[PDB]
Design a binder for this molecule. Structure first.
Ligand SMILES: Brc1ccc(Oc2c(Br)cc(Br)cc2Br)c(Br)c1
Length: 1182
């Protein structure tokens, strides 16, 4: 919404840049004007053949007499028109180079200045300006927004003026050559603008319906693939597939309806557009029979107007490119034009010599940019005598850290003054002030260069001697010399990450080359290891003694030797003095001392598509007919002008043009019929395989075991995405792109034959010219993409050192050295600058060539079409036919290169979709094999079980686990932590087979048992029960599948679960909908329902996995009261964390490092004193 003045945007264009754009836009207008003139000559060539075509047939008496005056007229006329033609091609060759080169030249020159001025402006802002902004968005604003500006001031403006030239020039030649046909052509324009306006309303409203249609199926997939362990445990994998298959069945019905209506729309609009033209052209014929327009003049206006009409559309993108570049330049120039109060680039203010360093802070009130919300310094008073070292102490707020901020004048104070020596800080030059102030901050930062360079960031003029004495005076010399490569080592976020106490020591050495008169040490010892803290602290004490120093830390070790100590309370300075006096005061300081003491040939995807042997042959045969039918419109147009030029006697003409215009309309409707058929067949053929694919994928997805769903690669979102994308993509490859790719090869094929058998060698010539201008058009785009990737790689190096400069900014400005990053950025940009100059010459050459190759190609079409061809007993009516046939057949092959990525993007989406079906699990619930024992009573034997999780085979959970539990008794499961308590329940559900050892139930190893039948006897209840969106009766009936559960049966379980108070209280009762779609209830009710579905199954085994995890107050007392009643009649395993509710258990087992450690009844483990006694004691006392 915000934008920029047009002149301010070009403020960096001066002298030559203003000229380049002028010559550029000039040649751009010359370029545009060239085309409607080229079509104007196409009319004069018609009248030459028409004056001879009428007189050649007017004879029927003399033959050799027509070999003289006709051929002479043709000789003088065709050589004239061909000479003019060769002239236009040389013109476009020059102006197209001038057009693109000059504009790209002005673009590159300015963006170089923009980028330099922009980065210079970024470094000029004061710190308060950064505290209110996002540096990441700013740096992306530096590289992205400058690109948008370049796109708008580049050759796009030349294209814009070239287009308006065609538009004006087309309608000038239109109006002058004929004021009637133009008004007629404009009269049908609203119909064309109205038919394509039905497209913007149908697409935008139906693209939502499909994104709404699958959103109903993808919601099933989401709540399924999120609750996968629950459907796996309850075996609803046939139902959850059925529901998805039922929503897939609706999405395909809405997809064929959209296929019916959209193909009805596309054909009807195409028929309206082609009927609109043919009326304007048949109207053209109605004015030649009246001797008011020449048959060649009808063409000149009909082409020039339609050319200029579409030139409007071909200019609209360049308008948006310029406008976006304006609005992109707003926030950029706003930074360049913003002027600071602090500067630091300013050459102003005093530079005191012999600074003795007597600092004082006077009545300083301050607040950081969070402004009226907080005021961190309510008044202040502090002097620090020269040579002395004052220490600032404080409980919190870190108003301590604020004085160092003000002392460098990173901010100016709200009220009061900071005075270095006797002068106010604001009277001294900002840069010189920061140069007489050395800073060592808590988190030290080193830039990605050599140590000597990072030390060189203290002072640019320095020799390895001073670097050596600096690091040796910080006792940082001993440890870097042992490091390889000496001073030439590397540091940064990338490479050679060092110890913190060593980085701080380089920072002290960096600040030491500064030889500052003032020193500020902010928590430089804080947050550092204890051993190296002394190594650095010795350098700090050796860094002072020559300077006046303010130091802030929470280490009361460094503070004793300070000549003065200062305490803060609420931004108010409270206590000050030597260490002993503060202890005698027994105030804030004394208080704190005591406290601290693969693209491949995939045919099988088409073999699945072979489910429909028809519907394809219908469309292909229909598309090839439509292919063969398109050039027949060019044949008609050829003979509507052909018989009109080859007329002779004029009486028969008027009756013939009516017959032709009639047949064309019969051919257009027969094209509409074959277009609605080739679009509906492919549409319905691609919609059913979308169901088959999403069905077979979602089926195979439910086949995999919990091992697969645990993968970080496969999350519920990444699976639904993989589920939607791959299925839609393969529909496109077998969809419209194929029907079109066959219609077009049929369109060229049926066009090439007609042209070949008519004009001999005429076609053989055009087939030499067209593939070259097409390849030359392709190679230009390859060079275009090559130049694009290269410059992206080069400015990336510049923006990389821009990222470093602005992300670590508050440090660089503390060290000054901002001019350094400017020059580095300038040198980095100097390569893309000289690159951008060559770009203009390249872009201009390629564009001018592809334009010249099209115009010279046109000259070859007629100079050969006349002369050698028409000096033969030939037919001009054929030369026009081969032009339209071949050129349109070629431009229809131009659609092959556009649908090429639709094939690759689909094969890649097919690559994953064929493997996701074929991948097989280790535990497949689908296998019907397995024993299915007949004996009811349930035991469980864990024997020597070692288990590791396939995602994390590092820390083991189960090592040699061994349990046993008889029928009808409760096995309590206590654990120090982790899923060692929970993995038991997962292995019994056989979510995994154990690595070593085995687990039996009735004595049969579950590994040889039937996987589904096994889980069918298990009453799993977990921490967070997930309930799908449906009737609670259904969430309950989910406990028993392969059979519909009775109402009184799901009542009995709801009675059992003590949830009946809700189920009757509701208005809908058992038919109420749950799942945060229809209704919402608290967790206690959700769990009771999960208990109900658990025992709707009537299992012989309950599995209560911390069932009271998330619960509170009376809700726990009522849920535990339901679980306690659900067991005692069944085999049970309870890992619940309530050991008070575990007291009445038949056997309590303590898990330790995967081994069983203690086990026995409650009082038995209470008699022993150890882990279980400690577990019961710790949470009964607390
Ligand atoms: Br009659 C007649 C035939 C083709 C005409 O232009 C074309 C041409 Br040329 C090709 C195709 Br496809 C469709 C149309 Br409409 C005109 Br205008 C009038």
């Amino acid at each position: 919404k915000p934008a920029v003045s047009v002149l301010t945007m070009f403020r960096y264009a001066g002298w030559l840049d203003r000229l380049y754009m002028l010559v550029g836009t000039l040649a751009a207008i010359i370029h545009g004007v060239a085309l409607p003139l080229m079509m104007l000559i196409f009319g004069d060539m018609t009248d030459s053949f028409a004056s001879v075509g009428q007189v050649s047939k007017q004879s029927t008496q003399m033959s050799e007499a027509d070999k003289r005056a006709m051929f002479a007229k043709l000789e003088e006329e065709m050589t004239t028109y061909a000479y003019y033609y060769t002239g236009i091609g040389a013109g476009v060759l020059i102006v197209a180079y001038i057009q693109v080169s000059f504009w790209c030249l002005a673009a590159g020159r300015q963006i170089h200045k923009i980028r330099q001025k922009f980065f210079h402006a970024i470094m000029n802002q004061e710190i308060g300006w950064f505290d209110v902004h996002d540096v990441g968005e700013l740096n992306t604003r530096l590289t992205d927004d400058v690109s948008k500006i370049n796109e708008g001031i580049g050759d796009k403006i030349g294209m814009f003026f070239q287009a308006m030239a065609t538009f004006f020039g087309g309608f000038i030649i239109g109006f002058t050559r004929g004021w009637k046909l133009t008004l007629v052509i404009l009269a049908i324009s609203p119909v064309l603008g109205l038919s394509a306006g039905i497209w913007a309303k149908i697409l935008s409203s139906f693209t939502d319906k499909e994104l709404h249609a699958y959103a109903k199926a993808g919601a099933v997939a989401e709540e399924v693939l999120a609750a996968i362990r629950t459907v796996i445990a309850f075996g609803g994998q046939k139902k959850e597939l059925e529901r998805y298959n039922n929503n897939l069945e609706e999405a395909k019905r809405l997809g064929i309806k959209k296929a019916i209506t959209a193909n009805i729309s596309m054909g009807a609009a195409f028929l309206l557009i082609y009927a609109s033209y043919a009326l304007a052209f048949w109207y053209g014929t109605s004015l030649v029979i009246s001797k008011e327009y020449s048959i060649g003049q009808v063409l000149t206006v009909f082409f020039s107007v339609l050319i200029g009409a579409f030139s409007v559309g071909q200019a609209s993108p360049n308008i948006e490119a310029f406008a976006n570049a304006r609005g992109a330049a707003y926030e950029v120039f706003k930074i360049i034009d913003n002027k600071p109060s602090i500067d630091s680039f300013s050459k102003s203010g005093h530079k005191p010599d012999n600074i003795q360093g007597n600092l004082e802070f006077k009545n300083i009130h301050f607040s950081y940019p969070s402004r009226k919300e907080v005021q961190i310094l309510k008044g202040l008073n502090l002097k620090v005598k020269s040579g002395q070292t004052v220490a600032l102490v404080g409980n919190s707020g870190c108003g301590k850290s604020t004085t160092v901020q003000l002392m460098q004048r990173l901010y100016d104070p709200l009220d009061g003054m900071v005075s270095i020596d006797g002068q106010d800080i604001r009277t001294i030059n900002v840069r010189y002030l920061r140069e007489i102030i050395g800073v060592v901050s808590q988190e030290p930062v080193l830039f990605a260069t050599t140590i000597a360079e990072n030390i060189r960031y203290g002072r640019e003029d320095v020799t390895m001697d001073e670097i050596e004495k600096a690091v040796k005076e910080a006792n940082a010399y001993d440890f870097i010399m042992k490091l390889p490569h000496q001073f030439d080592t590397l540091v940064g976020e990338r490479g050679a990450q060092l110890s913190g106490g060593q980085k701080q020591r380089i920072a002290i050495a960096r600040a030491l080359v500064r030889n500052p008169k003032i020193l500020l040490l902010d928590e430089a010892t804080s947050a550092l290891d204890t051993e190296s803290e002394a190594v650095v602290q010795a350098a700090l004490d050796k860094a002072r003694e020559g300077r006046t120093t303010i130091v802030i830390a929470h280490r009361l070790s460094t503070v004793r030797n300070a000549d003065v100590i200062a305490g803060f309370d609420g931004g108010v300075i409270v206590e000050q003095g030597n260490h002993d006096e503060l202890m005698r005061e027994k105030g804030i300081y004394f208080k704190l001392v005591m406290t601290q003491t693969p693209p491949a040939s995939f045919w099988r995807i088409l073999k699945l598509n072979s489910t429909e042997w028809p519907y394809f042959v219908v469309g292909i045969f229909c598309a090839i007919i439509n292919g063969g039918l398109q050039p027949a419109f060019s044949v008609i147009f050829s003979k509507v002008v052909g018989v009109f030029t080859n007329g002779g006697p004029p009486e028969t003409q008027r009756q013939n043009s009516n017959l032709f215009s009639l047949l064309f309309l019969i051919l257009g409707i027969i094209s509409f019929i074959t277009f609605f058929l080739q679009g509906f067949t492919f549409g319905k053929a691609g919609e059913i395989l979308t169901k088959r694919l999403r069905y077979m994928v979602f089926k195979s997805m439910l086949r995999q075991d919990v091992s697969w769903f645990d993968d970080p690669k496969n999350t519920t979102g990444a699976l639904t995405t993989r589920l939607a994308n791959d299925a839609a993509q393969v529909k496109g490859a077998t969809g419209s792109r194929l029907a079109v790719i066959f219609q077009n090869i049929a369109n060229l094929g049926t066009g090439i034959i007609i042209s070949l058998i008519y004009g001999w060698q005429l076609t053989l010539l055009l087939l030499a010219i067209v593939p070259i201008i097409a390849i030359a058009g392709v190679v230009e785009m390859k060079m275009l993409s090559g130049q694009a990737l290269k410059d992206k790689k080069e400015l990336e190096g510049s923006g990389k050192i821009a990222t470093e400069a602005i992300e670590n900014f508050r440090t660089v400005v503390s060290l000054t050295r901002e001019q350094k990053f400017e020059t580095m950025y300038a040198q980095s940009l100097q390569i893309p600058y000289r690159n951008a100059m060559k770009k203009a010459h390249v872009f201009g050459i390629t564009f001018s060539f592809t334009q010249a190759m099209m115009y010279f190609s046109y000259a070859a079409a007629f100079r050969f079409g006349a002369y050698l061809v028409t000096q033969q007993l030939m037919t001009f009516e054929n030369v026009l036919l081969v032009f339209s046939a071949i050129v349109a057949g070629a431009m229809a092959v131009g659609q092959v290169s556009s649908f090429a990525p639709d094939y690759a993007k689909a094969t890649v989406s097919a690559s994953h979709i064929i493997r996701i079906i074929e991948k097989t699990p280790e535990i497949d619930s689908y296998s019907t094999q397995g024993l299915k024992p007949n004996m009811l009573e349930g035991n469980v034997q864990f024997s020597g079980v070692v288990f590791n999780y396939p995602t994390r085979p590092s820390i083991p959970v189960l090592q040699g686990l061994s349990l046993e539990v008889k029928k009808g008794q409760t096995l309590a499961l206590v654990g120090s932590s982790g899923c060692g308590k929970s993995t038991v329940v997962q292995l019994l559900e056989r979510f995994y087979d154990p690595m070593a050892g085995s687990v039996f139930l009735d004595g049969k190893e579950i590994k040889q048992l039937n996987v589904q039948w096994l889980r069918a006897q298990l009453g799993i209840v977990s921490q967070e029960p997930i309930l799908f969106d449906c009737s609670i009766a259904e969430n309950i009936a989910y406990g028993d599948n392969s059979r519909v559960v009775s109402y009184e049966e799901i009542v009995r379980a709801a009675k059992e679960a003590n949830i009946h108070q809700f189920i009757d209280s509701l208005p809908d009762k058992y038919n109420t909908r749950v799942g945060d779609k229809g209704t919402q209830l608290s967790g206690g009710q959700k769990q009771r329902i999960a208990i109900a579905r658990a025992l709707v199954r009537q299992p012989h085994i309950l599995l209560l996995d911390e069932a009271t995890s998330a619960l509170d107050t009376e809700s726990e007392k009522v849920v535990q009261e339901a679980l306690d009643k659900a067991r005692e009649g069944r085999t049970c395993i309870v890992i619940a964390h309530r050991l008070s509710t575990i007291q009445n258990a038949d056997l309590i087992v303590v898990i330790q490092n995967g081994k069983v450690k203690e086990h026995g009844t409650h009082q038995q483990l209470l008699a022993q004193k150890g882990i279980y006694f400690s577990m019961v004691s710790v949470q009964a006392g607390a």
